């Protein structure tokens, strides 16, 4: 209010404004969420009733990571306001892929590794993001670091079946499409396979339900056999046939990853 200098609207991008924290000129994003539009609510450690998004953001925002950090939040009469970290300079991964086309595998490896580490961090914090996609990934173009955003479709991580989902349908697995259910981890691995294909091919593999359930991955771009193999494994139709995060990260295609700064110097600067 007096704490923040409010700049322009960032980015059908909800209501997120550029901001500067007054105390120390920190770049922030100021995200407004209408109470009437929130379906999932939770309670904080002290029983303050808040949107689930706030609960999940607090759980992941302790320490450094590839997750955007919630710095503060406020309740207003008809909304919640969320103060989030803002890297600068930044571009989201969707626009990056649109402008550059299919990524070199070296770059895709670095990015994909970082998303994997970020999603492991969420899972270690008891959080399932449920909307892993290029649009929800920011690239810090100077540091070469990726940041996961928008926990508005997320849930507490659990080992039992999920029967609700409001993420992005084209990144959702066939068990969701066909049966209206999924397990968190295996569904996340499906969406990571869609993302990896998107990176190395320049667009997602499936647009329609029939393609999602079909179990057929055609490569439009030149992609190494090892990368093709990892993608097809992540997109196994049967959830139990998909790799664990450990198996992904030990896959031959994932060896010799660049550091974020190396990535920035080679591909972004």
């Amino acid at each position: 209010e007096s704490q923040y200098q409010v700049g322009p609207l960032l980015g059908g991008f909800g209501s997120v404004y550029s901001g500067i924290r007054v105390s120390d000129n920190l770049p922030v994003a100021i995200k407004h969420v209408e109470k009437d539009r929130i379906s999932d609510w939770g309670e904080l450690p002290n029983g303050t009733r808040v949107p689930m998004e706030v609960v999940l953001l607090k759980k992941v925002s302790s320490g450094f990571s590839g997750v955007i950090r919630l710095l503060d939040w406020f309740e207003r009469p008809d909304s919640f306001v969320l103060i989030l970290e803002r890297p600068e300079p930044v571009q989201d991964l969707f626009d990056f892929i649109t402008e550059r086309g299919a990524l070199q595998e070296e770059l895709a490896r670095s990015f994909f590794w970082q998303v994997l580490e970020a999603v492991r961090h969420c899972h270690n914090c008891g959080v399932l993001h449920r909307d892993i996609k290029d649009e929800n990934i920011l690239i810090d173009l100077n540091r070469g670091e990726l940041k996961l955003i928008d926990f508005g479709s997320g849930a507490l991580l659990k080992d039992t079946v999920y029967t609700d989902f409001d993420g992005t349908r084209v990144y959702s697995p066939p068990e969701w499409i066909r049966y209206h259910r999924y397990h968190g981890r295996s569904a996340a691995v499906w969406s990571l396979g869609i993302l990896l294909y998107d990176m190395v091919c320049g667009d997602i593999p499936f647009e329609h339900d029939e393609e999602i359930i079909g179990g057929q991955v055609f490569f439009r771009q030149r992609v190494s056999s090892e990368c093709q193999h990892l993608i097809r494994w992540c997109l196994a139709l049967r959830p139990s046939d998909r790799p664990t995060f450990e198996e992904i990260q030990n896959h031959p295609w994932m060896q010799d990853v660049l550091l974020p700064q190396e990535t920035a110097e080679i591909h972004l600067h």
Binding site: G12, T98, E135, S153, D166, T168, E207
Partner: peptide, 8 residues
């Protein structure tokens, strides 16, 4: 096929 965003 146009590359497009997809809402949640």
């Amino acid at each position: 096929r146009k590359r497009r965003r997809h809402p949640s």
